[PDB]
Amino acid sequence: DNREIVMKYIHYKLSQRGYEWDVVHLTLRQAGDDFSRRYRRDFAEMSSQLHLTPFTARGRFATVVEELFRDGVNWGRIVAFFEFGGVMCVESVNREMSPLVDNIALWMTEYLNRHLHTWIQDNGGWDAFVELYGPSM
């Protein structure tokens, strides 16, 4: 379920750069591109800030992701969580490490169900988000 959300976002992002790979989705495609725009405004595509290697990616991913929610969670920070993962999958493919994509998605899925699931429920769940973001599309 939350893993499907991860799948469709990864698939979506990967498509967005011409790479194939085998409602909450639409809203989330929207917020991420929204984020995308804002991010590329002040900084350069984050692919440049990513230094990746097969056996260093999981830790890197973890480190960053924890620095994100280290002090709190808000939907903005979660769309960011999404953008981050997807950018890692696109970088992966581009750096000739396509296999990782499948791993990155698992990492995300786990992180979602393990460390964010509580905030989500406590804060209205996914429909809450689909309703907050509603007026931004």
Binding site: D42, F43, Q49, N74, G76, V79, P135
Partner: peptide
């Protein structure tokens, strides 16, 4: 700069922007 700080700033800016786009839509 730090990738995580970049993510937070934008992450927050986006939260603020939709809470506002939400206030408006009321």
């Amino acid at each position: 700069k730090k990738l995580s700080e970049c993510l937070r700033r934008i992450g927050d800016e986006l939260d603020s922007n939709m809470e506002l786009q939400r206030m408006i839509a009321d």
